[PDB]
Amino acid sequence: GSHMMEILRGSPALSAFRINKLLARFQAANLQVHNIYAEYVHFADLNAPLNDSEQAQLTRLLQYGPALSSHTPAGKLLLVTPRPGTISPWSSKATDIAHNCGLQQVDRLERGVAYYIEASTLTAEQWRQVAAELHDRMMETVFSSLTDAEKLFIHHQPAPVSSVDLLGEGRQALIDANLRLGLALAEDEIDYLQEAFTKLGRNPNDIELYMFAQANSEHCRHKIFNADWIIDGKPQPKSLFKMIKNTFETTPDYVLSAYKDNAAVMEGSAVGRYFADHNTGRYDFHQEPAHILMKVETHNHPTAISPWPGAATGSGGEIRDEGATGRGAKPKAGLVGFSVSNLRIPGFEQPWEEDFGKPERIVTALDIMTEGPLGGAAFNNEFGRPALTGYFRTYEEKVNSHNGEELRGYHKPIMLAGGIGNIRADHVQKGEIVVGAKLIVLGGPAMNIGLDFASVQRDNPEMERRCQEVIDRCWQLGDANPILFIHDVGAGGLSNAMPELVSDGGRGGKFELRDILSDEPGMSPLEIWCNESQERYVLAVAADQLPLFDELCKRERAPYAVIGDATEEQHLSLHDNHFDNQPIDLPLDVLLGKTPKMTRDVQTLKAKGDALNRADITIADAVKRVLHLPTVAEKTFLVTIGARTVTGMVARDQMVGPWQVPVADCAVTTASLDSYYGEAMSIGERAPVALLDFAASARLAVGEALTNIAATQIGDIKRIKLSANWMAAAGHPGEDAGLYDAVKAVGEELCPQLGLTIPVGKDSMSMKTRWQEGNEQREMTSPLSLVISAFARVEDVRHTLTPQLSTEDNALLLIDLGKGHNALGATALAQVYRQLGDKPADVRDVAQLKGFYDAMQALVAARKLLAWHDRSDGGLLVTLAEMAFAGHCGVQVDIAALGDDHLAALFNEELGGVIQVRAEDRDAVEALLAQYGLADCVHYLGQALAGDRFVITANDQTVFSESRTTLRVWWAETTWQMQRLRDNPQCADQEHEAKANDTDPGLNVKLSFDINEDIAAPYIATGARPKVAVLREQGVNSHVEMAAAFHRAGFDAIDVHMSDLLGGRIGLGNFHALVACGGFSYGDVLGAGEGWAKSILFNHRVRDEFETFFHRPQTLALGVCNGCQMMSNLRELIPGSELWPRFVRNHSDRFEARFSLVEVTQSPSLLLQGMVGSQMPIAVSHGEGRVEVRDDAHLAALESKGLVALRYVDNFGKVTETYPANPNGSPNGITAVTTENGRVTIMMPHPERVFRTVANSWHPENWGEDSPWMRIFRNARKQLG
Ligand SMILES: Nc1ncnc2c1ncn2[C@@H]1O[C@H](COP(=O)(O)OP(=O)(O)O)[C@@H](O)[C@H]1O
């Protein structure tokens, strides 16, 4: 009542292979199911009626997706929808499109999947088993009628505040509320609340208690990290935090901000910061320092319960940290980490794996690594930051460690998300908060998320994107940046972030509950104030900047509300206009009143640990097992799921070389689109070492970070800055003393001796899982797990080395920082034979580690290196194998000098690595290494050689010999199997099988023109700069680098949001060129690019503006990725486009981020003039790029008209539909088409991301500044005259 639900049937929902996985899942559980069929169905909750025309508009918005075989329903209906009381992100984004298409009648759109199942035996018991399989019990519910969906839209009345009756019952009322509300309060904290409230003479409200309990938890007060310690009977002088701070006291160098914000900041470089001016809308370079922020976060517990949103909001919360650094900043690139228990992939179990069971309430390791990476990548992709480095460890074994024989592993996973961003010098310091400052929530209408449903998070990355654009508009105003103060909303929701915001400014605040934006009107005041809804920030802004701030938000379509005022009195007030009362009324010192410090009085446990039993170990069997341990094995399933080219500033991504092998040891970005200065990121971690030796695990993490970053041009080691993220089972015998010792080992010792700061860190301190298996208690406990992320300013992005071997005359030299210790404890080798072993690796000599770093820096600067790969998991064996994989070559090595224990020489995980040098440079490089005190560690191994032979000799004996292709295919099998069970198995198999064909020549180039002839230069030289409209919808993310590419070609790039067109601020009549940029407009909901296009079509004024533009005789338009999608959906407005295809879900059913080989084909395209017959790699980054025609008649007609402009080719140079050479399954390799007149071109790949040579993942050595793709932008300039 007050609202009607309309049901609108959508398109078929599951491809054939997905239907076959279902049918087969049913046959495997003995459910005789003749057939299954699925159809999306949509639900529109309307506040007013739709006329015949709006009805048709709504119907048309809800036609999208691949044109799959439609069937008429039969059998039993099971409809799967979100759980009632829940609103999906699909709903947020779809309803938004509805509103921007003028359908204000729509209150909410929601979507379900209708399953039509013919089975016909099946007891009601078995139907519950069918129902179970079709849905996720943590997010969804199953219904029997389409009608039942009305349950999703029930309007609820605001629930009132509840007082806890301390006055009337005494202390028992606090104890009862402590249990009922789950406050987890300690006795001394119940004491405090009793005293504080007895003094005020009134009962506490529920909200006030909940706020207090959120603020005084472990994760939030960091009680363990500030604790005093007593260890083996001796009081210790320093807390853990103090020992971390010791690194900043010792090395403050280059540090701009540390421990005073939710990211750290270091000095960057002076470069062209590129953005649109507030007054002109023109993009310009602003020559100024771009300083570098860094942060790394975890999101471990949620990910155990619901991994997709758990990982996604892991990234999302950390991106908010970055944006809310100082007075606003811009995230640039990200990193991702997973640690989980054994994967045990069905049909692919490995000999070290044993099922130990798990709690019913958590998902398996395999579920985490299936859905979690897709979740992390969904936020990074739809937000728009490249994910360029990461780690993925598996560990689960019964082991004789510090507390005797017990199960150690990661049933509670590590889910790690971090990254770097840029910030202006003047915004690094947070400002003062003036009295009467407006206090604002920027971002999403809130719901009851986080209050085991309360650990199920929810991500809407496009909402966050819209918020970032506002934040960007604010810092881009320089001295006029209206942001006085900004902070992210995370744990505790507003009940933490608003008090933290006023409190860091020395203020109080008065707030109004009913000013806060909400999508559940039923929520209690406690739910409104304490819920952990996502994509929110809190800021302060002066009252007189509010009109400005409103103009900025409205142009971005970023929702915001003013919810209160900052006060001089240090009081916290929260009024409720609906119930005319005051849920919160407290002094801030009472809320933020602290109880005493914690003292931990603890004892050292140290494991004895036994020698590696080698009975079943051969070097050959060990090579095979080690390459099948997911920690070692190829990571493609984690890398290609995320964009790696967004921004146009990525110099080094995971994938290396012509054969695009994911082994890059660190990530590198350019600082700007006009510099070779940059930033670098690397990770070091070695948790299983902590099962033998806590200090050594931490030291090795520091050292690996350094070895992974070392072939990058940095200089001074003091440029390198660390995040230290600590994961422990605090309280588990031996760990606490372990934690203190490991923090000491890096904070007090190693990092200060090296000159390394740790200005940021986090901790997560209950890394264990307890459950009942038989009548038995069971425990899985993590090792102490330090993850070090290293971050650095880069002097020259171009000088970076990769593991890609050259086959020119060369020498392979090992730098064995293990000094022949050759430890085998807690290695991959031991793990893969179910053992812990004796003695682990460690940092053997700090001077020599420093010496290594400085020596690598001298060799990099002087260009003496052809390649570098450090030694980590899997030892020298893996290092050499991976270099041979990346170089598509052989290796001939001798290990006689590495000791008689050949297994230990190859498989120790001591620090160091293999450099490759030119043969003629060998002597000079050995002399240089000797000057840094290293002669003793440096060992000539042999050479890289053309071919397929991987050979390891010792004197006259062959220690190990195998085909390099055979090793490379074994190392691939983990990612193959993961892709097989997650993606379309046909694609997974084609990708895998192409690795086995050694003749694959890899990416290679043929150019039909001179890539250095700047054909636009005569035009640029006149000083006349035509405008191009760089068109962007909400969710677009590639506009900045697109602008920069047109800029290099001599245009004035103007920023045109769709809101500028809708509001009449820009007219396309003033432009001769237009480009629709890439991204995830509306998060691709209702089809990639559809919302964007249909919002143009359904507005008749704007529709007419586009049509007029395209119907002019000389205008040019380009659509790229999302933009191509958009323009393919606007096709009725574009002359000569009648044969154009649609673009739909990739055949792989996976987001594909590839460096793909294409060829330019003959077509009218004016943007491709001079390039025809050229073949070169381009950045590709999409999930809905598959060309779909309506039938073969459409395809032939398209082809015979000569309108295809780009095709995917394999590395042999033939047009292909084989994956991933053709990443999406497009017929005849098609990824670009033009119009009959050549004036409009649309393409899925991103030329604007790779117009700079430095930003191509692989490129030929001889190229200059400009890639081949720079010709497009220049062709645009020349054509305009
Ligand atoms: N979880 C992940 N997400 C994204 N990239 C990852 C992930 N795990 C590993 N990678 C990338 O895969 C490559 C190989 O990883 P790994 O063998 O763990 O690195 P290393 O041994 O050099 O520390 C690297 O380029 C790394 O950055």
Ligand SMILES: [Mg+2]
């Ligand atoms: Mg590795």
Ligand SMILES: [Mg+2]
């Ligand atoms: Mg490495």
Ligand SMILES: [Mg+2]
């Ligand atoms: Mg590593």
